[PDB]
Design a protein around this ligand. Structure first.
Ligand SMILES: CC(=O)N[C@@H](Cc1ccc(Oc2cc([N+](=O)[O-])c(O)c([N+](=O)[O-])c2)cc1)C(=O)O
Ligand SMILES: CC(=O)N[C@@H](Cc1ccc(Oc2cc([N+](=O)[O-])c(O)c([N+](=O)[O-])c2)cc1)C(=O)O
Lengths: 121, 119, 121, 119
């Protein structure tokens, strides 16, 4: 639960359930204008991913949360439209914050929103 | 062919198609403050309904468009969450020209958006 | 947090924040085919509503969660398109369950999903 | 006027309008496995982009459509969450005829859906 700075929440709109065991890769745009592996995980039984980074580690930058939606759907036996879902944003530019990226998935569609709260600094 | 100040567009998020043959019933709130039938139809092959009304019969007021989402997934043999999808809006043409009411459906969710324009 | 059977979560897509102090009215379709007041609330600072009903009270039926979106937007100074958001579903027909109705709001749009988990019975 | 096997539709959820003058850059994944520019344009007045390609140039493959969402809200002086919206899909016409890629935007969220059809 909020304490970490980057939390991801994935729901399944076909089943009306959390999207479980969904793979998520996080990237930081390097100095060279290339994406650099930052963190990864799988969502739990509640479709959340926590413990990705820490505050000292999560500096300002452009990150990409890539969610592997193709894999989750294939595995439930659907051939979905998308390759994956990718969310690109600028984090911590006017100070550190807490970020929640939620993705609501369906086979030919996905919505996605962000909740940003001010820790304090 | 006849001013369509009101249009509905329904789409299927599972299959990536228009949702066709969806029952849409529209209602005008009456002073007695109940709903009164107003226009009805089934979405075409492109998941659209048109010729619902005309600009003379469409006066300001509270309208409710109701989509029979449940029969839609049933026919597909997929178990739905909702009984139907509903949109309640105030039509205030003191500006507003055309109204497109779109809904994206999934077994457990639905989005809806309005496209209100002039041309 | 899950323990109650009907929980509502409302997010603001314009601000990227929980939709706070949002009024929610819950109805049960009577025997007579009329909606009967069932419960009401306001969402908290985290855009959730809990403690609406109890398990013994929430029998099978058709309920309507009506969210007063017009009021929240007006108050932030927008004239939104919708009158309110209303969610109609059949609850507890093949046994009791836990229901989470989330609504993601914008001025001319709203998405909404349901998470249903099996308590046990 | 020319087969448009690919179409993008952008809409604004704050204002209830098409999103016009949105930059859309499409890309074809190359074996070198990088993206290669493929088609580009700005949405019209109805928030649509067409004449992106033709059925001969559109072969199976991994495509990415990228929407410059951020400049869009900027021009409106509303602070955005995302740098842009992206859709990666495999175009496998061994069936598929037309592709409509729609995106509904808000300052902190976006939905996207695909409408894949035959007619
Ligand atoms: C009128 C039209 O262009 N018909 C198109 C497809 C289409 C694009 C966007 C849209 O609107 C819309 C899009 C999304 N979305 O995610 O892209 C969405 O979530 C909603 N919605 O929730 O109501 C509506 C509705 C329909 C077709 O050729 O079938
Ligand atoms: C559990 C949790 O993370 N709480 C978060 C916010 C949050 C994320 C996703 C979500 O689900 C959701 C997401 C979308 N979406 O588009 O991303 C959506 O459209 C809907 N919806 O329509 O109900 C729900 C609901 C709520 C918080 O910090 O309070």
């Amino acid at each position: 639960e909020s304490k970490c700075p980057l939390m991801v929440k994935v729901l399944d709109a076909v089943r009306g359930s959390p999207a479980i065991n969904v793979a998520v890769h996080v990237f930081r745009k390097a100095a060279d204008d290339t994406w650099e592996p930052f963190a990864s995980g799988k969502t739990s039984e509640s479709g959340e991913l926590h413990g990705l980074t820490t505050e000292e580690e999560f500096v300002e930058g452009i990150y990409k949360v890539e969610i592997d939606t193709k894999s989750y759907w294939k595995a439930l036996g659907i051939s979905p439209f998308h390759e994956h879902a990718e969310v690109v944003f600028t984090a911590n530019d006017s100070g550190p914050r807490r970020y929640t990226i939620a993705a609501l998935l369906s086979p030919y569609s996905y919505s996605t929103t962000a909740v940003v709260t001010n820790p304090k600094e």
